[PDB]
Amino acid sequence: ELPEDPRWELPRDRLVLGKPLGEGAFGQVVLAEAIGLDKDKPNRVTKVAVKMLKSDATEKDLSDLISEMEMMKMIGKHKNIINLLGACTQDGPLYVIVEYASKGNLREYLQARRPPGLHNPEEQLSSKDLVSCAYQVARGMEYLASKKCIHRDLAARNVLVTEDNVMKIADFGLARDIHHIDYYKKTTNGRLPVKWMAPEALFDRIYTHQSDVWSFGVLLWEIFTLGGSPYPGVPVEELFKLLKEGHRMDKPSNCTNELYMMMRDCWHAVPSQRPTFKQLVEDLDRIVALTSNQE
Amino acid sequence: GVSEYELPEDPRWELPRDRLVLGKPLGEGAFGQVVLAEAIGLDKDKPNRVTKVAVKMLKSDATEKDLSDLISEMEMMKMIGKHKNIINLLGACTQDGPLYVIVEYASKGNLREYLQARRPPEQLSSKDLVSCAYQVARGMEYLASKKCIHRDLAARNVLVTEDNVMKIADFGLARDIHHIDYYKKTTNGRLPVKWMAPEALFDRIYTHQSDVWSFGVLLWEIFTLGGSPYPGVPVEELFKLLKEGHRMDKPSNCTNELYMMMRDCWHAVPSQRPTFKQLVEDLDRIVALTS
Numbered sequence: 215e216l217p218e219d220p221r222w223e224l225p226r227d228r229l230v231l232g233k234p235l236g237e238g239a240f241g242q243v244v245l246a247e248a249i250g251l252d253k254d255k256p257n258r259v260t261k262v263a264v265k266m267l268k269s270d271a272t273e274k275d276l277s278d279l280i281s282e283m284e285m286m287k288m289i290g291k292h293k294n295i296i297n298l299l300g301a302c303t304q305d306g307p308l309y310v311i312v313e314y315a316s317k318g319n320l321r322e323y324l325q326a327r328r329p330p331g332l333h334n335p336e337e338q339l340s341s342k343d344l345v346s347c348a349y350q351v352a353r354g355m356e357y358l359a360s361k362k363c364i365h366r367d368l369a370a371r372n373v374l375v376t377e378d379n380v381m382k383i384a385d386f387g388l389a390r391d392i393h394h395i396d397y398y399k400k401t402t403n404g405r406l407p408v409k410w411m412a413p414e415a416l417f418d419r420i421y422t423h424q425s426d427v428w429s430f431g432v433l434l435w436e437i438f439t440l441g442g443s444p445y446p447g448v449p450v451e452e453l454f455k456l457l458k459e460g461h462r463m464d465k466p467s468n469c470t471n472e473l474y475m476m477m478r479d480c481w482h483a484v485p486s487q488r489p490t491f492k493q494l495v496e497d498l499d500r501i502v503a504l505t506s507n508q509e
Numbered sequence: 510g511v512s513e514y515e516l517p518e519d520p521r522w523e524l525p526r527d528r529l530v531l532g533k534p535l536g537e538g539a540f541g542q543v544v545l546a547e548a549i550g551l552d553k554d555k556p557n558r559v560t561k562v563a564v565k566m567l568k569s570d571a572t573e574k575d576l577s578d579l580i581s582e583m584e585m586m587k588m589i590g591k592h593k594n595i596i597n598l599l600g601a602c603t604q605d606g607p608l609y610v611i612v613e614y615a616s617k618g619n620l621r622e623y624l625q626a627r628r629p630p631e632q633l634s635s636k637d638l639v640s641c642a643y644q645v646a647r648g649m650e651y652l653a654s655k656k657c658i659h660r661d662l663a664a665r666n667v668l669v670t671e672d673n674v675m676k677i678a679d680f681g682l683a684r685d686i687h688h689i690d691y692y693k694k695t696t697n698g699r700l701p702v703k704w705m706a707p708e709a710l711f712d713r714i715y716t717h718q719s720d721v722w723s724f725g726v727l728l729w730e731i732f733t734l735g736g737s738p739y740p741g742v743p744v745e746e747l748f749k750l751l752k753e754g755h756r757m758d759k760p761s762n763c764t765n766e767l768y769m770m771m772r773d774c775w776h777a778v779p780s781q782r783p784t785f786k787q788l789v790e791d792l793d794r795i796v797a798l799t800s
């Protein structure tokens with residue numbers, strides 16, 4: 215039923231399906247092993263993530279999956295985004311093969327590395343490490359912006375960490391125009407997505423790279439609170455009021471005033487006055503070089 | 510966990526068992542034991558160069574957890590790499606038989622013992638003591654550059670070789686930062702918590718800067734020639750002293766500059782403490798200007 219694309223096509227028999235990994239807006243995604251993903255590496259297996267359709271999936275659900283795959287092909291590859299590795303489209307269910315991130319999303323990664331409870335973590339992140347995650351996400355966002363891709367839901371839950379601690383933006387090719395969004399719908403973790411949305415995207419339904427910069431500011435706040443949850447206990451109706459009044463989240467402890475000013479700039483009420491990702495990459499780059507890893 | 514019946518191999522470290530002769534025991538712990546041994550052919554080009562070395566292994570009563578802790582130590586050492594002022598990994602017998610981790614041997618024991626046995630009635634000069642400190646700071650700067658947090662830097666964990674070189678030991682030791690019994694004493698009868706930075710002692714927050722605090726107590730140990738910090742102070746009283754901002758007094762035969770260096774390491778604010786990079790630089794300058 216679907217057209218063949220020899221660029222990305224991998225034979226179904228070269229893929230060994232493993233355990234689930236989804237149930238988090240990412241759809242039903244499973245871990246797998248791909249044999250000979252590369253033409254020069256036929257005898258080598260690579261762990262990958264595989265997206266597919268559920269049992270009762272309408273012809274529409276199929277439409278969106280195909281578009282996400284096309285979108286990824288157009289956008290191209292980058293170190294800081296979940297990349298497309300291949301696809302199984304002939305003789306069987308549709309399989310979109312993408313990069314696997316063994317350490318999960320950034321929110322979980324940060325929470326699991328929080329300081330000891332007075333909870334007993336096995337690894338801790340230095341200040342340089344934190345600024346470095348911020349830098350990588352900005353790098354991935356800058357690349358996406360350069361390809362005219364507007365994310366629309368930038369948040370730590372949508373940033374993934376590979377076994378080598380590389381940050382990767384996911385869900386950037388997700389089907390759009392679904393902006394008929396239910397402001398009261400909670401994330402699988404129990405948080406309201408509206409808390410990461412620029413006021414113009416939230417009230418005037420206008421989405422731009424500038425609104426993605428506003429989200430990135432919230433994301434920076436998440437990184438420095440070690441996976442803190444914005445506006446805890448605040449319901450949608452009250453969030454609208456907080457934004458109409460120009461309220462801004464407070465400064466996280468263990469956060470330099472410069473990083474907090476960066477957050478405040480991303481939260482400028484005027485979209486054109488917010489920095490760009492190009493500017494954020496440069497600032498963060500400089501700051502990383504100057505931030506101490508307690509060495 | 511496959512190490513139950515067989516351990517993974519690593520040819521660039523493996524040493525044939527016939528090339529290792531176990532000897533006199535050097536130390537004993539809860540997890541394992543260390544014995545003296547002569548390795549025949551450690552270094553390439555010298556397949557007859559018998560080297561005196563120390564061998565870490567498990568005791569007869571060890572469990573799977575102890576084995577995995579010894580393996581982790583060994584792996585951490587490979588990852589950390591070599592440096593003159595740390596005890597280095599030299600080899601290992603991992604196949605067909607008990608796991609043996611071969612490291613460097615320091616014939617003059619730990620720093621505390623070394624200083625005590627040389628207290629003026631070959632004794633040490635002011636320059637030597639500063640030299641010891643410099644060496645330790647250098648070893649710690651290397652470790653810190655490799656992301657290694659010691660967590661128990663003390664003179665008992667610094668060994669001294671035949672050539673009087675200082676080597677930090679137990680830096681790759683897998684420790685559970687929770688199961689810490691503040692009342693548990695060292696073989697020599699002292700309380701480890703006396704070396705612990707306040708934030709690590711109260712919030713279990715271990716950083717390279719918390720090691721700097723320990724370094725300051727080790728500095729005090731060096732200039733008291735193996736003196737015992739807070740003699741007779743039990744754990745409960747120690748906590749109270751720290752909350753009060755109490756600081757050990759300046760040792761006799763110790764400059765105001767070296768004492769300020771200790772007090773700096775004992776800053777309540779970790780970010781205000783110097784880093785090991787700055788300690789190595791200052792001690793380098795101080796060593797030069799020392800008689």
Ligand SMILES: O=C(O)c1cncc(-c2cccs2)c1
Binds near residue numbers: 312319384
């Ligand atoms: O959930 C994970 O652990 C995981 C890990 N790696 C990749 C992914 C995804 C890629 C693209 C969409 S999901 C998800």
Ligand SMILES: O=C(O)c1cncc(-c2cccs2)c1
Binds near residue numbers: 565612613614618668
């Ligand atoms: O006790 C000694 O003299 C001595 C001398 N050299 C090394 C050690 C080590 C023990 C554990 C790791 S290295 C001990």
